[PDB]
Amino acid sequence: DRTNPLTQIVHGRKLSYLGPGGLTGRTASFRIRDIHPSHYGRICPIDTSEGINVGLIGSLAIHARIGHWGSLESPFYEISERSTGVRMLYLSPGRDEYYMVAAGNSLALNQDIQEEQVVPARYRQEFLTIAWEQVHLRSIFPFQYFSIGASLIPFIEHNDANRALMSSNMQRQAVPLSRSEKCIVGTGLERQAALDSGALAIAEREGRVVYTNTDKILLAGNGDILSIPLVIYQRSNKNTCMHQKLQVPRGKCIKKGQILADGAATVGGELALGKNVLVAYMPWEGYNSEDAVLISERLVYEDIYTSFHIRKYRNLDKNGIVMLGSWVETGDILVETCLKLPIGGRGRVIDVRWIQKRGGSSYNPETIRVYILQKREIKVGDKVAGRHGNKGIISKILPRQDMPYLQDGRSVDMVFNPLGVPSRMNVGQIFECSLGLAGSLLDRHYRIAPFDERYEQEASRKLVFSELYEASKQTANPWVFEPEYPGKSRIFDGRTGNPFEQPVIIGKPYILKLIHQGEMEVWALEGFGVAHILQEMLTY
Amino acid sequence: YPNPPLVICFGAAQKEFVPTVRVSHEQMHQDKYSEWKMLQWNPPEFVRAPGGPPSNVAISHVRLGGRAAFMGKVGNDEFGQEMVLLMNKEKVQTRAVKFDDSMRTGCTHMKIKFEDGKMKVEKVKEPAEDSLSSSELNLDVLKEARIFHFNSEVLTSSSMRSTLFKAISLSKKFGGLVFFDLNLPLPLWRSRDETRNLIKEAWEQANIIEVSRQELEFLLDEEHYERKRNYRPQYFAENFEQTKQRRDYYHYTPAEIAPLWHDGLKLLFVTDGTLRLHYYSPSFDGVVVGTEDVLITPFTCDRTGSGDAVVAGIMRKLTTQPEMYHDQDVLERQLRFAIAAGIISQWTIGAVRGFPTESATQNLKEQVYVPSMW
Amino acid sequence: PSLSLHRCGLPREIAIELFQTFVIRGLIRQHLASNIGVAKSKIREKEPIVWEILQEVMQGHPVLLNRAPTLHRLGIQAFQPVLVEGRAICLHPLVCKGFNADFDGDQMAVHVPLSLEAQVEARLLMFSHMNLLSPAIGDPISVPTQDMLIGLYVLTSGNHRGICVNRYNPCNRTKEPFFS
Amino acid sequence: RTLQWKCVESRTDSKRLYYGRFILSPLMKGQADTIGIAMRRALLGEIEGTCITRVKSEKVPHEYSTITGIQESVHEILMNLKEIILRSNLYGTSDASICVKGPGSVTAQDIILPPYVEIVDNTQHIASLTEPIDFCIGLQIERNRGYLIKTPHNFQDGSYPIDAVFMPVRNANHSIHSYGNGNEKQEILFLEIWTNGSLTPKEALHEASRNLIDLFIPFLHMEED
Amino acid sequence: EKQEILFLEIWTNGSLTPKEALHEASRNLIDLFIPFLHMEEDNKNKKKIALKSIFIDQSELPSRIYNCLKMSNIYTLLDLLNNSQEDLMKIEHFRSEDVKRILGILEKY
Amino acid sequence: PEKEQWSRWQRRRPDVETVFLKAMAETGQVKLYGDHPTLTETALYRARRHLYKKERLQAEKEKLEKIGPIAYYSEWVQAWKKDTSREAIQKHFEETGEDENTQLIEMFCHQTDREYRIMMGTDIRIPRDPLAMRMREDQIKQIWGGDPVYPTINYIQDPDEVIDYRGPDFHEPTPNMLAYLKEHGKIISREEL
Amino acid sequence: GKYVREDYLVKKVSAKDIQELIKGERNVPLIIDFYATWCGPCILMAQELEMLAVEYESNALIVKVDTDDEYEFARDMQVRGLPTLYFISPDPNKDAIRTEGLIPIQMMRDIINNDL
Amino acid sequence: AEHVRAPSNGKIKFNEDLVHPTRTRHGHPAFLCSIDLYVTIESEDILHNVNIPPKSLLLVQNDQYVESEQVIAEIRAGISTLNFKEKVRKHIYSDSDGE
Amino acid sequence: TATSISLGIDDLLTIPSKGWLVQDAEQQSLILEKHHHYGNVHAVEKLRQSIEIWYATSEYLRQEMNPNFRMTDPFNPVHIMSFSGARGNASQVHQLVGMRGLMSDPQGQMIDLPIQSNLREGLSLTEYIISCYGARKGVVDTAVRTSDA
Ligand SMILES: [Mg+2]
Ligand SMILES: [Zn+2]
């Protein structure tokens, strides 16, 4: 799946219970689908393929490997008074059960030796609180229990697991846009994701860059010159353009493993699947009664959510093939006898290749492959989704003058419905919005590791409010952090210019663009009593 | 004079300098520095809370609330001006630092002279190691100061020993205490006789000394304590608490430190490092307990500067609380602050980058200990 | 929100794909068309006359909308199509709430009756204003949604009345004038 | 003549970013809100601008193909030409051209314009050249309002249209404060205007006022039958 | 092309016809927007941070003055240049001899 | 228990209500039993919150009507050091013939953009609580409980920064499968075969 | 390895290799770097040394020695702190340069281009 | 199911002659009331009385200072639970080695 | 649209007394666990007490949530959304502003460790792992019930 660099790395980490010599869909009992205490740190508890094949398709954890016996193992840290005292051991699922595994901090002192203090531990597939003298192993990695999709969700401690699964599913359905931008608030794993994606040109040798060009890059090391090609507007397997940009000037030194050229949906070596937009949470004339978004018109003429799509199949030449640069329309033929573009497909023919020789062991000119490019601007009906499970369908586009504006005088880009927040149980989105606004005002980017409450209680609140107040005091914008209601600000109406009677949430979240834009009917028609309509439908 | 008493951090200015360098038994890969972080989770005994130059101490003292003045000499190169800038940006008074356009900061010229053995000699010294007392010591700063901080690095140079002695003389004439934090460099770990005859003049002119546990053992006796910590009872457990087989936090009796006491000494600190802080006064003893939870952030997990934060917290509490000399409970309640500061200073790569503020250290002290402690 | 209970927003391409037969009949009927090929070429040319004739045809012709999952009995309803620009069908919020609307894009099948009997049955029986009570027990299936209930609650909630509106006891010491 | 307005602040953050602040102190009770909202709706969506509408290259197969000697593709060159800020006062269509040769960087100083149109930034980046190749590009300028969708493609072959945006004012904001006159309620009005350099905030204010007056005039004409 | 038609509805209490209300409102709006057009009649170390980032400490000063300026939140030379002599006088324990010495030191370079 | 046990709830939870209660206990608006607001007092303040805001806004309006507009708005114009009393304004009008509005415009002409954005909290449409407008940084930091224990500098990343994959937190570069298997002798080249 | 390239370029030498390289003749500068796996500041010095070795592919010789296996040789070189670099000139009459601390790469370039 | 809680802080005063000694399921010591009793909470200003006659498990002693919102008694859900007895076997695991 | 209701971080309010209930519950749990090691109680009792001393505590919180909202902050946005019947349910609100409480797998199998933190304060790693059980149970019973119906 070459939709985005994320599907390329999350597709190989899948585990399938079904297959040759495996349990079927309906034959599998209900006890197989539920989570087991042995799956900790080895199989992701969040990632699950929805549908009839639920619980049978799972994702492998980050810190997991095969243990020479077809068994998946997880790292653990010894905290026993031994000769070495520190050794990251890989434990088989059967051997780890016999040790005391505790995931807790040592920041506690109650007038004792610090070893008599209690800590939640896991022993014999059961949870219990024991002293610090009885613990043998200790899990210290943050991303040890989650997969790639669940880890890319910032502030995951404040959301439910169902919305985590929804976000992990929606992140796969992301479209690489024309220009990419890094997220202000991230988890810190986008770097390794872009590294292991494969769309980034990494240096295989050390040396200076002596020649930079759009088609190739020349790297000169110890006399030898290495030529590196560059992908320029290629087609993926699911109609997605692939392009690579340069990020190193000419005449600088490089080492093996450092980036020479960028890639699609990546900027600066980090995954970039969306843009930062100013968002307010409020009801607006019922356009967002359901899950729906009322976006501003700035996203249309500023080339924010513009994407490219490449599909394969008077303008006809002498031989009959459509020449390069032709603008085909719905109904135009290019080569029944002549292939015609279907409804909804129109764009520039970038290149045509004649498959005179098939490779199917014969030279089959069954047809000549043609490629069209369609730059799809963001329009009504498109689905925009965040990294916390929030999903919305665009309902209306309004001009810049009709959108609500803040006290600084800037019009909001998107308007979301607030009633969904308590319905789907997502709290991390508010933290993300506030921290993104603070970072945009302070010109900073944040990369936070999950479960920051282990350091102290209410750590995320402090992290967000401190940055908000710093942005409010460095730049003279008191509306950013108001003491009466921190995180909320008063906005105005765009039509009448009157303030609303209640403050609203203001922030800059990271919004992604999604790719996706019988007998019961007969029973219903018989219940209504429309016999002629049913007869006509059956005859049709 | 402002309300917070000013302190002087005399010494040299170096970006990242670990003076305590000894031999470690366990070692890691040669080239892969990505796995060198494992030895900062279980460090050797002598690098559990390393110190640094007095500039880091001044920076941590200013960040924790207070006023610090750095007394040294740097060159007119880019590195010296950069370091001065760094200090200034963090509000460390730098009236004292002097600029000389003769030597380069950090650069020390040496001659190899391979004659039946690698024996190098110093021809030219760095400006950080060459500070004169003819017109460089700023009398004013010395006059307004109450704690004079200096390390044992200045004793490894024959050009700053007399300057340090003159500074101590003036500070004691004006009515200021003298702080001595050893941080023994590499040449000082050869033999205890030479290191004891070389650090004897400054030891007798110090009111507050913060030794390390390994340093205290190296000064008194190393093999004796190494054998004591491996007693291995065979029949029974006498103390009734040796059956759990835990670590050995040995509290040195006041009679063992007797050959190191003198008349002018006011306080002593053993400073095991974020775990135990043995304090010794001429009227009482004690020990405070720490946490050492550096495993909560494995990816940062840097303890390059940890003793500097403890020294800064101790100096702050001494300059603010005068009752720490004739009271034992106040002393513990104030040393818990330095313990919390040293604990926070281990969660960031870089010493100057991760020095905590007063509010964060007080929050950690209130979150770790019980309300009856603070 | 601007649509009524009976009208529905039909995209332009879907509308022309559905009423191609009727618009070709209208072109060949009055004028401006002599054969099926000329009419098809005029319809493909995207002229204003073909859109005007499409609107005149779909002015009063009922259309049927049915969700792909027909779980409930009211999943198949009839509406009057309105020519709207876009690639999404616009429906009423109340009918959407009554048709089990989801966050994801719910596919909608559009069917057009042909015979007179089908049109009469769709206009007299399958409209939304004739089916408002669920057949289970008789409760209204079309009730105000979340936003409407919030608006009504804010309207009819009032405000504070006691210690939250006055600080001290009013026993020591006028309201708005009497509005006629 | 009691109402007095004056430009309180005037700064130039960049050659394509201007800021001006104004005040209207002796204003009355309900007039401030109306003036503010009308001036805001007039400064955002009623002032007009001149931008490049159509670009004609020498010989390229399509807009997504690359060209030798130039780092950026044709699409990036079109996106860079889209951001060029121009200034004009006459409606219609004018032609311009860029004809730079040699290695270097082609900028706005390289665009030759009719005597009516001028440039503001004069330092914007269009493309980069690495080989001594002649770069010859055709341009087309037009004055209008709003943003234009490149739907038509007739009357010319071999030219790629660009979706221009005729919006001189970037952002606007107004604040209303009390005057403290006791019985009579008087209010002070402030105005913030950010322009892209094509016209100063004072000229934008005057033009928005004139446009509002032109919109309100027809109600005073004779009733048509 | 996208043309729009406006539909105004007016309800008057009888004191004036709805047709006159339009003219009155239009004239009032014009009178409110005219004032925006009214016009009155006419009648070593030489770099950037080498001097800007110079904190007061480097420029030698007597102790008294140094301490005073510090309590006054004056650290760099730009903070000293922004503050005038009158407010400088306001600073506690700051004297005229000091103002002449700080001016000299700032001019002695 | 004889020994005081440890807990994560030993420390009180910081809230805006406590900060506002302390701020209004200072200056003598309300009286609290003790120096620290308790939980019942915060719960009561949560219900009676708009009354004190309205009282403070009324006090600000009275001060504005009493001292005059110039002397009132001079708080956010520090570059204008001149007599702001009404007698001084009348004397200036009698001397130079400049009305009060002219002097107000002249004093606003010497105002910075930061000062204007701070003054924008006195709008008639959105009047901010005068207590929060003049709150010190020592009181605002108590809303969330002071500086965090974990340093924020570990989370801050420069926006225009290219990630260096030769760092302590990245694995070794993955070699090409063909070259990796050819070096170890698993695959032989075409010529050598 | 000839098909794959070595990831790391700074080689580890013993106390005898340094003495053999000093007592001989050379035409390129020599950079000695003392380090120990335990020190934190060191992780940051290795990257700078690798970049400096990439910048000078054959115009300089960058080698590193360890203080856990050559402690006596480190003490004989009057080494006081862990991050210590020695810049030795090719002419056997110019003195060496001992630099202690995390110095920037530009200072290393300036030293190599001017002092050595 | 229903847990009687203390209305305010004070002393619990009740006559221990009518209550008969017992052991709670949770292992704590307790008192069982087979008849109606009236407990008094000697608070700063007022008093309070509550109890259930058929089944009351009193978890508190006489002259005991209690704070607010503390579980004092259990109604014991005297109404009978559905009789679906399921017997389950939990296993105790040795923490250390020995005889 | 005129009112523009919105939900914020500080807008989520917890019952004034939570630090007391959780503290006394964990204190009782400690006293029990000490005594267990002395032989004063048996495991079944420990198991039982733990579940109960936690369930009762949680319910006090849930039941008390509504009075707090109506008495103290009547017009709280979350309270408006819950009481009006628009979005959410008392159970959902409780998880956001109170405590998620004890939860077990299908057919018993209690986790034996309670969830003392709501979504605003932030669930621990163990609490998140425990909640994943109920999440999986829900997402599978949905499909099972649909296929059966
Ligand atoms: Mg759906
Ligand atoms: Zn959190």
Q: What is the general shape of chain D?
A: elongated
Spell out which ligands are present: magnesium ion, zinc ion
Question: Taking Cα atoms only, what radius of gyration of chain D do you get, to the nearest Å?
Answer: 22 Å
- The span between the termini of chain H is 42 Å
Share in helix of chain H:
under 10%
> How many helical elements of chain H?
0
Q: Which two chains touch over the largest interface?
A: A-I, 68 and 54 residues
Overall number of strands of chain D: 15
Judged by helices, strands and strand pairing, the structural class of chain H is mainly beta
Widest sheet of chain H: strand order? 1-8-6-4-3
Series of H and E elements of chain D: EEHEHEEEEEEEEEEEEH
> What's the number of extended β-strand segments of chain H?
8
Strand content of chain H: 25-35%
Main sheet: strand order of chain D: 7-5-10-3-12
Protein name (chain C): DNA-directed RNA polymerase subunit gamma
Family (chain C): Belongs to the RNA polymerase beta' chain family. RpoC1 subfamily.
Function (chain C): DNA-dependent RNA polymerase catalyzes the transcription of DNA into RNA using the four ribonucleoside triphosphates as substrates.
Binding site for Mg(2+) (chain C): 102, 104, 106
Structure description:
Chain I: Belongs to the RNA polymerase beta' chain family. RpoC2 subfamily. Chain I: It comes from Nicotiana tabacum (Common tobacco). Chain I: In plastids the minimal PEP RNA polymerase catalytic core is composed of four subunits: alpha, beta, beta', and beta''. When a (nuclear-encoded) sigma factor is associated with the core the holoenzyme is formed, which can initiate transcription. Chain I: It is found in: Plastid, Chloroplast. This is part of a larger assembly, with 9 protein chains of 7 kinds. Chain B is an alpha/beta fold and 374 residues long. Chain B has helices at 54-63, 78-89, 139-143, 161-174, 192-198, 213-220, 222-228, 307-320, 329-344, 358-368; strands at 6-10, 67-71, 73-75, 98-100, 107-111, 121-124, 147-151, 177-181, 208-210, 267-269, 279-280. In chain B, the strands form 3 sheets. A 7-stranded mixed sheet of chain B has the order 2-1-7-8-9-10-11. In chain B, strands 3-4 form a two-stranded parallel sheet. Chain D contains 3 helices and 15 strands. The radius of gyration of chain G is 14 Å and the shape is globular. By secondary structure, chain G is α/β, with parallel strands linked by helices. Chain H has no helices and 8 strands. Chain H is extended. Chains in contact: A-B, A-C, A-D, A-F, A-G, A-I, B-E, B-F, B-G, C-F, C-I, D-E, D-F, F-G, F-I, H-I. At the A-I interface, strand 7, strand 8, helix 3, helix 6 and helix 7 of A face helix 1, helix 3, helix 4 and helix 5 of I. Bound molecules: magnesium ion (MG) and zinc ion (ZN). The site of zinc ion (ZN) has 6 residues of chain A, from loops. Residues 102, 104, 106 of chain C line the site of magnesium ion.
Task: Considering the chains and any ligands shown, give keywords for the structure.
part of a larger assembly; 9 chains; C: 180 residues; alpha+beta; four-stranded mixed sheet; 13% strand; F: 193 residues; mainly alpha; 10 helices; 1% strand; binds magnesium ion; binds zinc ion; transcription; PEP; PAP; DNA-directed RNA polymerase subunit beta; Fructokinase-like 1, chloroplastic
